[PDB]
Write a protein that binds this ligand. Structure first.
Ligand code: CA
Ligand code: CA
Ligand code: CA
Ligand code: CA
Ligand code: CA
Ligand code: CA
Ligand code: CA
Ligand code: CA
Ligand code: CA
Ligand code: CA
Lengths: 659, 659
C-alpha cells in the first residue's frame, strides 16, 4: 500500500507512518525556485530509495550523493519497525543551486512509525491470528476464510424476558462466550503525535446487525462497555504505547434474511486533525468482515438428544408408551401438560468455530389461535428467533408440521451436506395456500439448506409431515423416504377381504366409534371414498416425483406405508385413521401412531404389515396410542412431539452454496 | 426425469407421456386380490422394462413371459418418439391366479407421446437452439450460459412520450428487434387428449420485470398480443398438432437494482384437468431463465461517436474552437443552445447477443433547479433510464459530473474488463455530502463496473470531474490518469517569478477581471491562499492514493496538471482559473479549457506547460475558450460537453463478477 506524502516548501513535515504501507515522497515541490540538485540524509530505521522515472536506488544514511531535481525523481520511504521513545526517525533533503556545494535550503520529514491491526479469527480455528491477509473478505468452502459471528439469541439470566441481543447491555460474563473476539493490536511510542486519534466505526446499516463490547476491570468489578452497535456508529480509542492489545467482543443481532446477506464489517482508522470545522482525514484504515451464522434444521437421521412431548395430563397410555420408547434410548424425555410443540416450534441450531447452541424458530401468530409467542424455551445456550408477517395473513401452512428437512443428499452431482428444507405449498396457478413469504424468505436466506416446496395443499391441515418422513437404515449411512400410500392400504384391505376377513372391525376399543361399526367390507364398498383416495394417491405420487427429483432418490429409497383419507368440502384430505408416517424417530427405534386397523387373529393388520416392511431393515417399531383417551378418532391428533437433535458434524462454512 | 403412473385396479389408465421423461408404473395395485403372476404386451413405440427390486429387463411386444406379483416388481416405460394419428401406443398387463394360464383380469395404459420444449438462446449466439440443457440456469463467464434480455427502454415511434416498456402494447414491428426470442416447440397428434392444456406462466414478482408478445397475422395486418407481463400471469396456449413452433418475443421492463438481481423466469406446464373446483395438476413443466442486461458506462479511452455540446448561442469562440477540434476527428458535433448536458445525463449502453444500443441515465431532480426530467433524447435505439429519490434529498453530488468510469484495469490480479465506475463522496465519519442511495444502489446493482467512491466533498460543487480525467496514450493500449495539482501550479509560478515574470498578468483580455490586476506576484504573496491550496493538495493526494489502490496504478501512470482553487465559507474549493483536467477527450485530440494563465513572451505559461507534459506522448492539445463571452471567471463553467462513445468490444456476459 503506497501513500503520498509531500515535503513542504521551506518547512518541515511531520507524519505518522503506519507499518505495512510505504510513502512516495515528492521532494521537488519544496525545492526553492532555481535549485538544481538535491541530496539527502536519513536515520537508521528509515529506508530511503531515490526513484528516477521508475528506477529505484537505495540510499545511505549519510552520503553526499546528489541528483537532479525533477518532477519525476521522487523518494520511496519505508520503515520496518515501530518507533519507540528512543527513536528519532527522519529523512532530511538538502537543495543546491547551480554554483556552490553548500545547501541553499532544506526540507525534512519527521516520522513516527506505529503498527495498527484489527484482527479476527478469519481462519476459523477459534483463536485470533495476527493480521490475516484475508480478514477483509469472506469465502465459502473448506479452503475458505473469514470470521464468523453468532446471533446472540439465547438468554444468560432469567431476570429479563428478552433474548440477549435485544439490548445494548451485557450483564453476565458468560454472555461473552457467545461472542466473537476482535483484537486491535498496536505498537508505538508513549503517545500518538499531536493531531491524531484512532477510531473504530461501523456503517449506519450494520448498526442494527452487531454490537461490540469492551471489558473494563475497574475497582468494584468487571464491567461491559458497548462501544459500537445500535445508535453508536464510532468509538474513539484510548491509545496506549509500547506493544498493546485491546480485546473486543462482537455479537450478531440479526439472522440473514431477505435484504440482508449476513455479512457485516467493522473498521478502524487513524484520523488526522486538520483544523476546526474541517473533517478529520482518514490516514489509514483497516477492515474486518464477519458473516453471521445461519439457522440450520436437523433431519431425522441425526442423533436424538431430547424428546419434547405435549399431551393432556390424563392421556396415560400415550405417556406410558412414549416413556417406554424413550427408555430404549439415551434421550431425555421432557413432558408438558395439544399439538403446539410440533406445530409452533422448530428446533434448529447455530454454530461458529468458538461456539454453538440450539435455537428455536417460533411459528408466526395469527391472532386467532396463537395470539402470543412461545418464549418459554428461551434460556442459556437455548436461543430464540421468530418472523412475523406484517401484512400477509397466517394459514395452517405456516405451522411447523409443514416444515421439515431432508438428510444430506447429492443431486445431479451437487452435494447438499446439510440436507434440504422441505415446506408444503400449492400449485403455482392454483390460488391455494402457501407458507407466508416472510418465513419462506427467512429459510431461503439461510442458504445452506436450499429449500424445496412440495405439494401439501391437498390436505385439510396442509402439512408435509402428514404424508412423509425420513428414517435412517440401521448399520448403514443410508436412509429411507417413507410415504403415506392409499394404494397400499386398499391392496391390503382387499387381500384381507379375499381372505375372509371382510367383517373385521376398525377402531376396536374406541367406544365413541362403536356405533359406526366400520369394517373392511364397509370401507371397500364405499365407492365415493375409493375415488377420493385414488385422487389423493395422485397427490402423493406428484410429491413422490418431486422428492425423487430434488433429493436424488430412486424407488429403492422409498417405503410406502398404508394410509387412508376422507375428503372435506374443499376437496382436501384428512386422516381416516391415524397417519403412521408421522412418527418419532430415535435412530433404530420408531414410535408409530397406533392405527386401530382391522383385527385379524387379534392383531392389527396395519401394525403387522408395517412391521413386515420395517423390521427386516433393523428398525424396531413401537406403536403409540394417542387416541384412546379420547374414545374416538375424527382425523385430528391431540398430542405432539418434537425431537431435539445433535448438530451435523459437517461445518456449515465448509459448504459452497450456489451463487 | 422419472414420473409415477399407476395402473388402476380393474380399469384402464390414459396418460400423456412427455418426451424426455420416463414412467415408473405400478402394476401390483391394479391386480385383483389373490392374483399370483402377471404378463404384459406393448406396442411398437413403447419400450417396457420389468424392474425387479432394482434389476431391469427389457420385454418384447408380445411375449408370454410371467413374473410374480410383488410391490417391488414394477415397470419402467419409455417412448422415444411423439404419437401421430397412426399411433396406438399402449401397454397391457394381464393377471393370473394360482391355477390356470388364462388371464383373470387385465389393466392397461394407453399413451399419447408429445414433445414440449420452451427454447431460448442460452448459448448467446443470437439463434434459438433446441432445448439447451443449461437453459434453466444462468452462469457468468466465457464458458457461461443462459439467455439475455434487454430492458426495452428506447422509443420506436415519437407519437407517444414514454419508453417502449412502460406499457403492455407493441405498435411497430421494429420493436421486436429489441426483444429476445423464446420458442415453444411441440410435436404430437392432431389434438391433446381430453382433459389437458398447455399453459405459459410467470410469477407475480416477475410480472413487472418482463412482457411477452406473440405475433398474429390476421386478415387486416400483423398484430401483437401481450400474453404475459403486467397483470397477466399466465396464458393458455392454443395447441397445434404435428411438428409446431410458437414464436414469442420477450422484453425486459426493469434494470437490475437494489432487491432485483436481474434474473427472471418463464414457465410452460402441461396441466391435467381433475374435476371442477379442483386445481389442475401440473403434469410436466419446462423452464427458461433470462438475465436482464446491465447499464454500462463508457470510459474516455473508447472511440468517440458524437460530441454533444451545450452553450449559449452567442458564445462564438467556444463554438468555433469546438467545431475545429471535432473536425480533426470523425465525430459528429451536436449543439444545443448551461451545464446540463454534462451534469444531467450520462451516456451508457446495453447489449444482448442479438442487439444493443445507447441508454441515457437521467440525473435525479431536486425540485429547485431541475424540476423536470430530460426525456428529449429518448428515441429509436436511444434509450432512457432514471432513478428518483423517494425520501433522500438531492445534492450537487448527484449530478453526473460526479459520475465517471475508469478504463479497463487489473488490480491485485483481478480483472475489471469494463473498468470501474467512480463517484465522489465524503469521509465516512464526516457528515458530509454523498450521492443519493437510490443512484448508488443502481450503479452497484449493474455489477460489471464495480463502483469505487472517491473523495469529492472538499470541492464546492463536489464533482470528481473537477479534479481528474483519463486519456489514452496514442499508439499503445495504455492510458494515463490526469490529476489536478496545486503544487505543480505553485512550482511553475515560483519559477516564472524567479525568472523575472512576477508581474505577468492573468485573465488577460477578460474585461470584467481587469480592475483586479491579478499577477503571479499577487498570487504567490497571498499567504492564506497558499495554506488553502496546500490543504487542497492533501485532498487531491488522498484521492491519488485511492485511485492507485483501486485501479492498480503506479506513479508512471499519472500526470499532474497545474490547478489552483479558492476556498469558500464551508472550507470547500472552487476553481481559481478554469480546471484544465476536465477536457474533451477524442482519442489523441484533447479539447482543454483555456486557463487564461500568466502571459510570458505572449504565450500562456499554463498552456505551454501543459503542452510540454502531453505533446511528447503524442497527445494533441487544443485549448477551448468558454469564458471570454462572459468577460470574467468566478469559478463556474457555463458550457458543457458529453461524448457518446462506442461500446466495449468485450462482452459483459464474459466477465465473472465477485459473488
Ligand atoms: Ca484463527
Ligand atoms: Ca445484551
Ligand atoms: Ca448469550
Ligand atoms: Ca450463551
Ligand atoms: Ca417440523
Ligand atoms: Ca443460440
Ligand atoms: Ca410497448
Ligand atoms: Ca424498442
Ligand atoms: Ca429499438
Ligand atoms: Ca459524467
Amino acid at each position: 500500500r503506497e501513500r503520498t506524502v509531500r515535503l513542504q516548501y521551506g518547512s518541515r513535515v511531520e507524519a505518522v507512518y503506519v507499518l505495512g504501507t510505504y510513502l512516495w515522497t515528492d521532494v521537488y515541490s519544496a525545492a526553492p525556485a532555481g535549485a538544481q540538485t538535491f541530496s539527502l540524509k536519513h536515520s537508521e530505521h528509515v529506508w530511503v530509495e531515490v526513484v528516477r522515472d521508475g528506477e529505484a536506488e537505495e540510499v545511505a544514511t549519510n552520503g553526499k550523493q546528489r541528483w537532479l531535481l525533477s518532477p519525476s525523481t521522487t523518494l520511496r520511504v519505508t520503515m520496518s519497525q515501530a518507533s519507540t521513545e528512543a527513536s528519532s526517525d527522519k529523512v532530511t533533503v538538502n537543495y543546491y543551486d547551480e554554483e556552490g556545494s553548500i545547501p541553499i535550503d532544506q526540507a525534512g520529514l519527521f516520522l513516527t512509525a506505529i503498527e495498527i491491526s484489527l484482527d479476527v479469527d478469519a481462519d476459523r480455528d477459534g483463536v485470533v491470528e495476527k493480521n490475516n491477509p484475508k480478514k477483509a473478505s469472506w469465502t465459502w468452502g473448506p479452503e475458505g476464510q473469514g470470521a464468523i459471528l453468532l446471533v446472540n439469541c439465547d438468554r444468560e439470566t432469567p431476570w429479563l424476558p428478552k433474548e440477549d441481543c435485544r439490548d445494548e447491555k451485557v450483564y453476565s460474563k458468560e454472555d461473552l462466550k457467545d461472542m466473537s473476539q476482535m483484537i486491535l493490536r498496536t505498537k508505538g511510542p508513549d503517545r500518538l503525535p499531536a493531531g491524531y486519534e484512532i477510531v473504530l466505526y461501523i456503517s449506519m446499516s450494520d448498526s442494527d446487525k452487531v454490537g461490540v463490547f469492551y471489558v473494563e476491570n475497574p475497582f468494584f468489578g468487571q464491567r461491559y462497555i458497548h462501544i459500537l452497535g445500535r445508535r453508536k456508529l464510532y468509538h474513539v480509542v484510548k491509545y496506549t504505547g509500547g506493544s498493546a492489545e485491546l480485546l473486543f467482543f462482537v455479537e450478531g443481532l440479526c439472522f440473514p434474511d431477505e435484504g440482508f446477506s449476513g455479512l457485516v464489517s467493522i473498521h478502524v482508522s487513524l484520523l488526522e486533525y486538520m483544523a476546526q470545522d474541517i473533517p478529520l482525514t482518514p490516514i489509514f484504515t483497516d477492515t474486518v468482515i464477519f458473516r453471521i451464522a445461519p439457522w440450520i434444521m436437523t433431519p431425522n437421521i441425526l442423533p436424538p438428544v431430547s424428546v419434547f412431548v405435549c399431551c393432556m395430563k390424563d392421556n396415560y397410555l400415550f405417556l406410558k408408551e412414549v416413556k417406554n420408547l424413550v427408555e430404549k434410548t439415551n434421550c431425555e424425555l421432557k413432558v408438558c401438560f395439544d399439538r403446539w410443540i410440533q406445530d409452533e416450534i422448530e428446533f434448529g441450531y447455530i454454530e461458529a468455530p468458538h461456539k454453538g447452541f440450539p435455537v428455536v424458530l417460533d411459528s408466526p401468530r395469527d391472532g386467532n389461535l396463537k395470539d402470543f409467542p412461545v418464549k418459554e424455551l428461551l434460556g442459556p445456550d437455548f436461543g430464540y428467533v421468530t418472523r412475523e408477517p406484517l401484512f400477509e395473513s397466517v394459514t395452517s401452512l405456516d405451522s411447523f408440521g409443514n416444515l421439515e428437512v431432508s438428510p444430506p443428499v447429492t443431486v445431479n452431482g451437487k452435494t447438499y451436506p446439510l440436507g434440504r428444507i422441505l415446506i408444503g405449498s400449492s400449485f403455482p396457478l392454483s390460488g391455494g395456500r402457501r407458507m407466508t413469504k416472510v418465513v419462506r424468505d427467512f429459510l431461503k436466506a439461510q442458504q445452506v439448506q436450499a429449500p424445496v416446496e412440495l405439494y401439501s395443499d391437498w390436505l385439510t391441515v396442509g402439512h408435509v409431515d402428514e404424508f412423509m418422513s425420513f428414517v435412517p437404515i440401521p448399520g448403514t449411512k443410508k436412509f429411507l423416504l417413507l410415504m403415506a400410500s392409499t394404494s397400499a392400504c386398499y391392496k391390503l384391505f382387499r387381500e384381507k377381504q379375499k381372505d375372509g376377513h371382510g367383517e373385521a372391525i376398525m377402531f376396536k376399543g374406541l367406544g365413541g366409534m362403536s356405533s359406526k361399526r366400520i369394517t373392511i367390507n364397509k370401507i371397500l364398498s364405499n365407492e365415493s371414498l375409493v375415488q377420493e383416495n385414488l385422487y389423493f394417491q395422485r397427490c402423493l405420487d406428484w410429491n413422490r416425483d418431486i422428492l425423487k427429483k430434488e433429493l436424488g432418490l430412486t424407488e429403492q429409497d422409498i417405503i410406502d406405508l398404508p394410509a387412508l383419507f376422507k375428503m372435506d368440502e374443499d376437496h382436501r384430505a384428512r386422516a381416516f385413521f391415524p397417519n403412521m408416517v408421522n412418527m418419532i424417530v430415535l435412530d433404530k427405534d420408531l414410535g408409530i401412531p397406533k392405527p386401530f386397523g382391522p383385527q385379524v387373529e387379534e392383531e392389527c393388520c396395519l401394525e403387522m404389515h408395517v412391521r413386515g416392511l420395517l423390521e427386516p431393515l433393523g428398525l424396531e417399531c413401537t406403536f403409540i396410542d394417542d387416541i384412546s383417551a379420547y374414545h374416538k378418532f375424527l382425523g385430528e391428533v391431540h398430542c405432539g412431539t418434537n425431537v431435539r437433535r445433535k448438530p451435523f458434524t459437517f461445518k456449515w462454512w465448509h459448504m459452497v452454496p450456489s451463487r
